Amino acid sequence: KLKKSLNVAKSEFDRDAAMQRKLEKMADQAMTQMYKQARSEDKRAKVTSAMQTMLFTMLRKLDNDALNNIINNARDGCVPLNIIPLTTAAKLMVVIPDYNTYKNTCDGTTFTYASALWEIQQVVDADSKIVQLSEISMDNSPNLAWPLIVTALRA
Amino acid sequence: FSSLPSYAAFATAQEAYLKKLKKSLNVAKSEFDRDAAMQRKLEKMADQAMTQMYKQARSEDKRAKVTSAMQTMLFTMLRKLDNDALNNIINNARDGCVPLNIIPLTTAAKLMVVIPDYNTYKNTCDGTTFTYASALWEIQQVVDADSKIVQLSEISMDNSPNLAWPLIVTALRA
Amino acid sequence: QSFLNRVCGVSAARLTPCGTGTSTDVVYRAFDIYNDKVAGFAKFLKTNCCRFQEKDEDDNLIDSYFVVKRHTFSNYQHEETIYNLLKDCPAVAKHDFFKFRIDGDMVPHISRQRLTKYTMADLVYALRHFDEGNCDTLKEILVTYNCCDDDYFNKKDWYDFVENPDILRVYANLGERVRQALLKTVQFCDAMRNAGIVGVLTLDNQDLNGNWYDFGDFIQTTPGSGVPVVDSYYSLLMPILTLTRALTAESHVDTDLTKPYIKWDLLKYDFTEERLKLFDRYFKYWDQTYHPNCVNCLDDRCILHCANFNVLFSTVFPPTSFGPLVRKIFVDGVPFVVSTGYHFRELGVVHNQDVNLHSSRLSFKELLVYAADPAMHAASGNLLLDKRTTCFSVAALTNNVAFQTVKPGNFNKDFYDFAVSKGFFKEGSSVELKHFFFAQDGNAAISDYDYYRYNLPTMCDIRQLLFVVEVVDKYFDCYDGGCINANQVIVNNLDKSAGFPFNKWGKARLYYDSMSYEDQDALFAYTKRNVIPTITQMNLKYAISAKNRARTVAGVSICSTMTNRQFHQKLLKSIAATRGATVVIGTSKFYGGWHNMLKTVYSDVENPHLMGWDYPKCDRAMPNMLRIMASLVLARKHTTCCSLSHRFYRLANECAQVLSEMVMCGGSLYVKPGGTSSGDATTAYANSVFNICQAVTANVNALLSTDGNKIADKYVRNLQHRLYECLYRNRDVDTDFVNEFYAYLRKHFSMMILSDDAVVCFNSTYASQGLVASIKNFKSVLYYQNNVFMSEAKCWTETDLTKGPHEFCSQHTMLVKQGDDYVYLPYPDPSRILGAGCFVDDIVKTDGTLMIERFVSLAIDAYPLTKHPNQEYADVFHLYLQYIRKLHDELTGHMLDMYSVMLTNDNTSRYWEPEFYEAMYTPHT
Amino acid sequence: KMSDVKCTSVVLLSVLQQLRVESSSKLWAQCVQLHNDILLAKDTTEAFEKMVSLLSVLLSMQGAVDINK
RNA sequence: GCUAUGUGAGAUUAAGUUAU
RNA sequence: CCCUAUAACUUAAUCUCACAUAGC
Ligand SMILES: *P(=O)(O)OC[C@@H](CO)CCn1cnc2c(=O)nc(N)[nH]c21
Ligand SMILES: [Mg+2]
Ligand SMILES: [Mg+2]
Ligand SMILES: [Mg+2]
Ligand SMILES: [Mg+2]
Ligand SMILES: [Zn+2]
Ligand SMILES: [Zn+2]
């Protein structure tokens, strides 16, 4: 009786082969899901560091002593957001579409906007080339690449 | 298909066909079935890889030669357009006569053309008006590469080697 | 002549009889009427009175009128008694009672003196029922009160808010006169209370100087206890208050137009007592309680009623007070600036509950809501003054201004010369090329953003809006909704953008993998108690079009998108899954879906015509009241899973995230006035709610503006009476009449809705009598509620239902024979299909051997052109077939000549036989 | 006849975009204005008129050599 | 109880097209 | 370097389920 002996042996190899296939597949899905999970937590650490350094540079960019004054003068320490750059921003950028807007808005080295004195520092055009203040004129207006961007400082 | 030895074995087992080699043709039929299925899987993924490498090769060829193919396509259909207004400014840019700014559609507007030799001048200008882009234009002046204003009587047949060859004509439309 | 001097009275004046003889004259005026038999705001003929024109001592006819009232005898004693109890008030007009012999009999006359020609009801009717070519009363009022002289009217489209924005200045010249009328009405109500007089105040008893008369229905009571009904007066007047900008004097010192403006404190944001004082001054006798902050409201109906008053009173206050309310927060001992609140134009002041002054560290959720907050980006950016736009500019993030352009399209030359070799693009052909990629310069993105100047603050008729919202809710009652957890969320695309500032670090897959399900549920529970303002980024769209206008698309950040998915996805999926409803989002046009949609929209209408309208500048000019209404309609599915303050904070998050959010446009933060953001998850559904709302209020305005005597059907007349009752008299929801009016609308005004595009099948006989809405009713409703002029060149009608709708989702309809029956098939414009083929947005699509899959879709979309009578239209489908076969042969040739073994290329001959495309339109899927 | 003009317009503007015309904003604005008008033009008499201007923008640059063509 | 071959259905991913 | 939302359809590749066939 050896035919039924290799019958029992082949049934045993069929059992262990089915378990072999499912456990190798199991190690496959386990190792690729831990690939996914390990790289995903690495992504989470990278995004945490990136958002943290973004907020940490952004706090250092804002000038606090002009800000703490208008916050402490508030009745509860709560102010609108629309007045924070209106009152505590050192720089002002003005985008000016043509010359008729320019001669009204910023004519001269110093203009007044939002109850403050602004000293014009630099003027660039839409190609971002430095435009002199002598170049902005009514007869030289078709040679300029409009709009002009005027960056000023708080006087 | 005919390229198998398993097909020849299954065909031999079937042409032998009672019940004892029926078992043989059944197991050989399962043999030939899994063999033809594996050949179909190989032809499957071979067609997949061949068409994928074809896609990436033709796409990178397009992205590589986009700018030269676009410059070649443009003068193919500009030639097809058959327009003497467009052909005037193409043949003039061929022999060297290129404008400095946009040709204005409006009348009485400034136009800055460059004429580099005397035959280009005489085949364009005759009198105080000159023809360009299928229109008559009014000469206002002509200035030099050495930056001095030349009037129309100064340039002529003999003293054209005497003056500097880039002549910039300021022109207003009729 | 003896009657004319009798009318002059003790006061000295010069008169001219408008009517002839001693008889009366008929005038066509508008009346707010409500009887036992008739109701509505309609134009009736006035027969009771006789009016005398007054003229100055330089002999030209002036606005003063002497109008005598010839009525019954018992009305004379009653009117005279009421007048003698109110005579001291300066709000009442002067009344001279007498009896004058007409035909041998003494007939009592009531002469009302120094009246204008038109009442307030004439103004409200002329502005709420606007029809160009029939606008002589509005022109007469505008000429009379110095808003504009008569040749201003000569200019074409003078009335259009888009083609002529000076009409807002012309209409705002009537604001001071309207404000005076409101003050006089308050004075008259106080006099009625002190004189113990009760009664309804209507618009046709007050002339344009603000003086009151007609004490016909007034009845006396104990002095000091008189209640006057002003619900109908104020609610009918409410759109005129913002169209004419009546409260513009309130921003000046002492409310005088010559004084300078009030300079408020820049730190001030509350304005609660100022709103209460405005309400107490102008709407003193309004019985419903007004909450200045809508966090204290009782349901969504109260939220709508109080937000309608907030949109009027917010036009007085400075625009720097609205928006996020920021506070100093200490993380790690380092001060931050985070937004711990929000001051809404519509919802008042909203304060975040879960704030912490000091935080030892920041959780991924805390970092996520601090990065999405515009407070840190605006508090560190430069100040920006942008003169290119009129919208409010907040801050410049970058030291430079970004100018992005739109490239031109890439030309597919092979398909074009294959098409012209087949006979296309000849002269005089019905098939042109009209859809191209239009290039844009660097100034295109900020000039698209300057179309939000078409959004104006709009006060609504609150009574009809409250009734209209109940009717609109019935349309969406079949669907099921509510909140779902984060594991039940189905995202279509995870490799799209994450918005600003989250696009700096990765896509949406990064934030859906970095965040656990517990983190997403904690973020949703955080938005149920707090308001997170977010930044929406505007990007120009590179797509084929037939118009040279640029198109921008709003990109909402991943925080708002992630929370709004958990709030709205169960309802949105339910709407898409449903078939055979009014809103047809999610219904395929293939496999017979177009025929089933057309059969469903026809339904069972007795005298059916077809009608389709247009919304000019739909997303730009959509008012915030209708957007909040649409959010409340979609939020009404949360009765079990949410409390009322949870639903309020979700509404406030929706407002601060997609209605009035900070918009980044080229490295620069701007304030968005309002409108719909395309990037928002619920934009398509909310536009469907808005469309159904505008159609229902068009039907309500059509049914109330008709003469109730001329309605022959008794059911429609009783329906009009109960309609006026449930709008203006009843204050609670009458669900039986809402069901009856909804059944009337489903029977006579059958609509098919998909986003902002809708087609309506309606009873044309009821429309020719005014019982259902028409094109003119839609134009009037879009005039006074949307602030746009809907021209009739963009609307269509169809009297023959064998032809389908004229256009739906930019598809036409033909009746073709498929098998043994006739079905409706959609077909597109052949220029659109040809344009997609001849031009592409990538150089990779210019060869066809890589893009056979692209021309198969174009062929599938262009199959029903073969059943067209035009041979040229039919030829477009065959051209795509022959080109697909040519691409197959060129693919075979090139892949053979480069690689020596031949591709077998299996199941590809189906692509150039029309049975594969014929199967896409037969009903068996 | 009109369609050849419109397709040559889009080919010319994509060539000009390849030659970095949009680094100068004013010239790129003039080019886009000419390109949009040719596409929306209802007659080929004045569509060739704008084509001369748009082609002269290319011919005024020496990034291409048309002596080869 | 197992193995292999085909035929359909559903789900996931990728690419594309149209509509709003 | 930027490129939205939703819906429908097409193609491709996988993975499960059902059915028919043949061996142990
Ligand atoms: P339709 O194009 O006529 O729709 C009008 C529209 C406003 O732009 C609102 C529809 N809508 C909303 N969001 C959209 C989007 O992202 N894309 C498109 N094509 N339409 C949108
Ligand atoms: Mg009256
Ligand atoms: Mg009366
Ligand atoms: Mg629209
Ligand atoms: Mg539309
Ligand atoms: Zn309330
Ligand atoms: Zn809920």
DSSP string for C49-118: EEEEEEE-TT--EEEEEEEEEE--HHHHHHHHHHHHHHTT-SSBPEEEEEEEESSSSEEEEEEEEEE-SS
How many Å apart are CA C653 and CA C556, to the nearest integer?
Answer: 13
Which residue has the closest alpha carbon to F1 C1'? C504
For residues C256 and C303, membership in a common domain is answered with yes
The answer to whether residues C522 and C365 touch, using CB atoms and an 8 Å cutoff, is yes
Q: Which DSSP state fits C671? A: E
Ligand 1 pocket residues where CB is under 6 Å: C 553, 618-619, 676, 678, 683, 687, 755-756
Query: Class of B86-173 per CATH?
Result: alpha beta
Could you tell which of C755, C809, C810 is best to mutate to test the pocket of ligand 1, judged by most ligand atoms within 8 Å of the CB?
C755
Residue C423's alpha-carbon distances to A120, C85, C882, D3, in angstroms, are: 64, 89, 13, 13
**Nearest nt by C1' to C498 Cα:** F4
A38/E2 CA-to-C1' distance in Å: 38
How many Å apart are CA B161 and CA B128, to the nearest integer?
Answer: 21
The three state secondary structure string of C276-342 is HHHHHHHCCCCCCCCCCCHHHCCCHHHHHHHHHHHHHHCCCCCCCCCEEEEEEEEECCEEEEEEEEE
Say which of C207, C231, C757, C861 is annotated catalytic: C757
Closest in C411, C420, C427 to D10, CB measured: C411
Interface test with A, best of D26, D27, D31 (most A CBs within 10 A): D26
Instruction: Give the number of other CB atoms < 10 A from CB of residue C461.
Output: 26
Sequence-ordered list of residues with C-beta below 8 angstroms from that of B40, at least 6 positions apart, any chain: none
Distance from CA of D51 to the nearest CA of C (A): 16
Q: H-helix or E-strand containing C883?
A: helix C871-898
The answer to whether residues C706 and C40 touch, using CB atoms and an 8 Å cutoff, is yes
Q: Do C442 and A47 touch (CB under 8 A)?
A: no
**Among C698, C676, C674, which residue's Cα sits nearest to residue C461?**
C698
Q: Do B73 and C849 touch (CB under 8 A)?
A: no
For residues C197 and C286, membership in a common domain is answered with no
Chain B residues whose CB is inside 8 A of the C903 CB are 47, 50-51
Q: Do B67 and D4 touch (CB under 8 A)?
A: no
Could you say which of C301, C320, C339 is where a domain stops?
C320
Upstream peptide bond of C501 is cis (omega within 30 degrees of 0): yes
Chain D residues whose CB is inside 8 A of the C411 CB are 7, 10-11, 14
Q: Say which experimental method was used.
A: cryo-EM
Burial C720-741 (b: 16+ CB within 10 A, else e): bbbbbebbbeeeeeeeebbebb
The answer to whether residues C453 and C390 touch, using CB atoms and an 8 Å cutoff, is yes
How many Å apart are CA C243 and CA C437, to the nearest integer?
Answer: 39
C844 touches chain B (CB under 8 A): yes
How many Å apart are CA C591 and CA C785, to the nearest integer?
Answer: 39
Kindly state whether residue C77 falls inside one of the protein's structural domains. Answer: yes
Q: H-helix or E-strand containing A105?
A: helix A99-105
Long-range CB contacts (< 8 A, 24+ apart) of B148-155? B152/B128, B155/B118, B155/B121
Ligand nearest to the CA of C121: 2
C856/E16 CA-to-C1' distance in Å: 10
For residues C61 and C190, membership in a common domain is answered with yes
| Count of the separate structural domains present in chain C | 3
Q: Would you call C58 a catalytic residue per the annotation?
A: no
**Among C468, C528, C522, which residue's Cα sits nearest to residue C696?**
C468
CA gyration radius, chain B: 38
Any known ligand binding at C726?
no
How is residue C33 written in tokens?
């009427």
How is residue A139 written in tokens?
């007869």
Kindly state whether residue C20 falls inside one of the protein's structural domains. Answer: yes
Domain that holds residue C874: 414-439+810-918
Distance from CA of D47 to the nearest CA of C (A): 14
Residue boundaries of the structural domains of chain D: 1-69
What is the SS3 assignment for C537? strand
How many Å apart are CA C785 and CA C672, to the nearest integer?
Answer: 20
For residues C201 and C249, membership in a common domain is answered with no
Q: Which DSSP state fits C211? A: -
For residues C139 and C194, membership in a common domain is answered with yes
Closest ligand 1 atom to Cα of C757: 3
Kindly state whether residue C170 falls inside one of the protein's structural domains. Answer: yes
Q: Which nucleotides of E are covered by protein (CB under 7 A)?
A: 1-6, 12-20
**Among A139, A138, A91, A136, which residue's Cα sits nearest to residue A116?**
A91
Chain C residues whose CB is inside 8 A of the B43 CB are 904
Any known ligand binding at C18?
no
How many Å apart are CA B31 and CA B33, to the nearest integer?
Answer: 5
Kindly state whether residue C46 falls inside one of the protein's structural domains. Answer: yes
Say which of C122, C300, C373, C756 is annotated catalytic: C756
How is residue C718 written in tokens?
């009783």
How many Å apart are CA C759 and CA C614, to the nearest integer?
Answer: 10
Sequence-ordered list of residues with C-beta below 8 angstroms from that of C735, at least 6 positions apart, any chain: C470
Q: Which DSSP state fits C207? A: B
Topology given in CATH for the domain delimited by A68-154: Alpha-Beta Plaits (3.30.70)
Sequence-ordered list of residues with C-beta below 8 angstroms from that of C355, at least 6 positions apart, any chain: C327, C329, C340, C530
Chain D neighbours, 3+ Cβ pairs < 8 A: A, B, C
What is the SS3 assignment for C272? helix
C330/F2 CA-to-C1' distance in Å: 34
Q: Which of residues 27-66 of D touch A (CB under 8 A)?
A: none
Q: Which of residues 11-30 of D touch A (CB under 8 A)?
A: 23-26
Closest in B50, B59, B66 to C903, CB measured: B50
C907/E15 CA-to-C1' distance in Å: 19
Closest ligand 1 atom to Cα of C551: 8
